[PDB]
Amino acid sequence: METPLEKALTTMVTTFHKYSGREGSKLTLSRKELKELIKKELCLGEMKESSIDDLMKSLDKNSDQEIDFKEYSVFLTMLCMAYNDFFLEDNK
Amino acid sequence: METPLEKALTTMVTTFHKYSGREGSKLTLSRKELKELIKKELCLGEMKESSIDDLMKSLDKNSDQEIDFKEYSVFLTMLCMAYNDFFLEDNK
């Protein structure tokens, strides 16, 4: 369609299909493998540490149950908010 | 940052800051603003319809309250999952 957010969602669904499109579901996978997707396709857990280190372990906390694209996008978003101080003015 | 899935987050923060960063919060905006953001970020009036309005109507529902970055990313995730049968197998 050639809109800029279409290329964001295209990127997210193509990188999700890089780990789900092996197997019997293309919208879900295990908590274990989404965690792995994030640290491979997004360099962040080497620039940053605090909270990112639990969110990683918080999929792997139960690990081998399924997730949909929601638990993917809230974690990508929540993790972005942990260094989005590039968009603040001050401590608030 | 600079790995392929960043360019999705980079897009989402670049677009969202163009309708939050009108006013004194560069991380929140109204339910009216999220509605404006999405209908300029994507064309939607020609593909899958109608089930795309009760989501936007669910912004109208409380229209003058605020919205965060996460409501924004789960609404777009939800809406992408609501009409990309184009990613599936058929069948359920």
Swiss-Prot record, chains A, B:
Matching entries from SMART domains are given as: EFh (SM00054), S_100 (SM01394)
Entry-linked InterPro entries: EF-hand-dom_pair, EF_Hand_1_Ca_BS, EF_hand_dom, S-100_dom, S100/CaBP7/8-like_CS, S100_Ca-bd_sub
Q: What does this protein do?
A: Binds calcium, zinc and copper. One subunit can simultaneously bind 2 calcium ions or 2 copper ions plus 1 zinc ion. Calcium and copper ions compete for the same binding sites.
Keyword annotations for this protein, in alphabetical order, are:
Calcium, Copper, Metal-binding, Repeat, Zinc
Disulfide bond as a keyword?
no
Report residues binding Ca(2+) 2: 60, 62, 64, 66, 71
What is the name listed in the Swiss-Prot or TrEMBL entry for this protein? Protein S100-A5
- According to the entry, every stretch annotated as the EF-hand domain falls at 12-47, 47-82
Pfam families registered for this protein in UniProt: S_100
The UniProt entry's coiled-coil ranges are none
